[PDB]
């Protein structure tokens, strides 16, 4: 769920998730997808595409199990959809941390009505 | 401040700082020191002795800045006391993580139990 995801993001990036990623660019947030504006935003794009392949579980509501062992996210669900869901969230957290080098605050609350259409997943 | 501390703890251990270390053993919490119950406890014993050495700055209220680059806590305070402060917090966050293997919930409490006089710092 959003709680797990949000905690993964903080553990990986060290930044407040809602603050720095709640509505970043054209893909991080609630406004669906959009042509990525940079690396960070591209992560969120891939993330939303990952979510679209889940069958049987809800990324918003459904919670799942995972541990933080030696500063590594380790998913631990028996449920295939919940496992995959956990892996979708782990992948974006790591991606966001890997692209902290070009994170642009001028995008934090970027106006999505300015974004171009996104290619289909 | 308490802000950076809790964050550091959560980042290193991946555990809720209040829930797991706000009332653990004889040193983890806000009730002074005491004879350490175990390694986790000892981490906190050292942390408190670390504060006592600080001269000038308020450990609970004074905020400092640090980096989480590559999932490592790097203190970068130009302020001596604040730097010494940040190292104390980083030290306990790492020690708490390193000793998760022996973490025993049996040592949590709501009302601090009996604790032999912890030797001087």
From Swiss-Prot, chains A, B:
The record's section on PROSITE patterns has: PA2_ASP, PA2_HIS
- Which residues are tagged with the site Important residue of the cationic membrane-docking site (MDoS)? 105, 108
Q: Which GO terms describe its molecular function?
A: calcium ion binding; calcium-dependent phospholipase A2 activity; phospholipid binding; toxin activity
Listed A to Z, the keywords are: Antibiotic, Antimicrobial, Disulfide bond, Myotoxin, Neurotoxin, Secreted, Toxin
Q: Where is the signal peptide?
A: none
* Any one GO CC term of the record: extracellular region
Site residues (Hydrophobic membrane-disruption site (MDiS)), renumbered to this chain: 111
List the disulfide bonds in this chain. 28-44, 43-95, 50-88, 57-81, 75-86
Its annotated compartments are: Secreted
Q: Which domain of life is it from?
A: Eukaryota
The answer to whether keyword 4Fe-4S applies is no
Q: How is its activity regulated?
A: Heparin inhibits the neuromuscular effect, myotoxin activity and edema-inducing effects. Bromophenacyl bromide (BPB) inhibits the neuromuscular effect, the myotoxin activity and edema-inducing effects.
Looking at the UniProt record, the site noted as Cationic membrane-docking site (MDoS) sits at 16, 19
Q: In which tissues is it expressed?
A: Expressed by the venom gland.
- Explain the purpose of this protein: Snake venom phospholipase A2 (PLA2) that lacks enzymatic activity. Is myotoxic and displays edema-inducing activity. Displays bactericidal activity and promotes the blockage of the neuromuscular contraction of the chick biventer cervicis muscle. Also disrupts artificial membranes, and provokes tissue damages characterized by edema, necrosis and inflammation. May act as pro-inflammatory mediators, inducing metalloproteinase and cytokine production from the inflammatory and satellite cells.
Family named by the database record: Belongs to the phospholipase A2 family. Group II subfamily. K49 sub-subfamily.
Under the subunit heading, UniProt states: Homodimer; non-covalently linked (probable alternative/compact dimer conformation in solution).
Indicate what this protein is called per its UniProt record: Basic phospholipase A2 homolog BnSP-7
